[PDB]
Amino acid sequence: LLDNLRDTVRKFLTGSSSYDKAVEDFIKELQKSLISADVNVKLVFSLTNKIKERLKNEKPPTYIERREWFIKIVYDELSNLFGGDKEPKVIPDKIPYVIMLVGVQGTGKTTTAGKLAYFYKKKGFKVGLVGADVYRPAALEQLQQLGQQIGVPVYGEPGEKDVVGIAKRGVEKFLSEKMEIIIVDTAGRHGYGEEAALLEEMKNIYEAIKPDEVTLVIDASIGQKAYDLASKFNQASKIGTIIITKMDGTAKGGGALSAVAATGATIKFIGTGEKIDELEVFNPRRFVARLHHHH
């Protein structure tokens, strides 16, 4: 969406027609591209109405061209659509720090667990990974391969299906090894649409491990349908954050980000590609800044 918004911006700034038609043309194209990105239509309409209103109340500061000022207001409001200017807290100040990853099946989460452990190893922490995703049988082997490849130890119990016992033995072992960051990879038996049961089901793992942070991993190709789960996830704990993965393998990452941001939850990271280091700290203002036409 942003790379497509770049070209629309360019067409708007290299001053073709009247201003008002240039603006009209741009808003239609924005509305169209956001619909295509699966953003909820009510957010698409509010966004453009808010843009149009700022433009009627806020003349450009002196020295600022009108078209430049229009674009500044569009960029500020795209950022607000994805959650607004905010820089999450990504380095823990309590050690040890236990992070429980949760989510529906297939959210780029075992990869996400290795990517998170890599991020924190690079930061100089001592991390241990707990492979408690026991529905998928491949998840553990996959985790053990990541760990081995990135030099972080992986606790896992081949063929075991008590996720609560695995998470509790793995955390206790890592806490005894005096690990500083402990990442517990868990999935869930439900999909999107079955949010109450998904959440209920996270409860006994959580109580067992008493993590410092619970992180819901969302695949971005769910789009705007991430809303319900994210909303209920976020209300259910004071320590919940969200990771949106696979932003590069969908057209619907704007729908997913905008739908999560509508809940107010914290999107701490986004997963961009499949490579181990492609996990980035997320700030809507920076995310939007990437396409700025003055660079």
Side-chain angles (χ1 to χ4, degrees), residues 7-25:
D7 309 320
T8 308
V9 167
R10 167 185 187 164
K11 287 158 190 73
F12 180 78
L13 296 168
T14 59
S16 223
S17 63
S18 52
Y19 183 77
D20 282 2
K21 182 199 271 53
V23 162
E24 279 171 25
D25 277 2

Side-chain angles (χ1 to χ4, degrees), residues 90-91 117-126 181 269 281:
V90 295
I91 304 302
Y118 183 83
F119 175 80
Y120 285 112
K121 185 165 210 302
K122 260 197 162 159
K123 294 338 173 167
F125 287 97
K126 281 310 209 145
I181 299 184
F269 298 92
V281 174

Side-chain angles (χ1 to χ4, degrees), residues 63-87:
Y63 288 99
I64 300 309
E65 311 150 10
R66 283 173 87 208
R67 282 192 193 216
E68 290 283 350
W69 180 244
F70 174 77
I71 295 303
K72 179 284 169 177
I73 283 164
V74 169
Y75 300 148
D76 287 343
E77 298 301 331
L78 276 170
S79 171
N80 287 161
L81 177 69
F82 299 141
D85 186 10
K86 164 231 162 82
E87 203 57 62

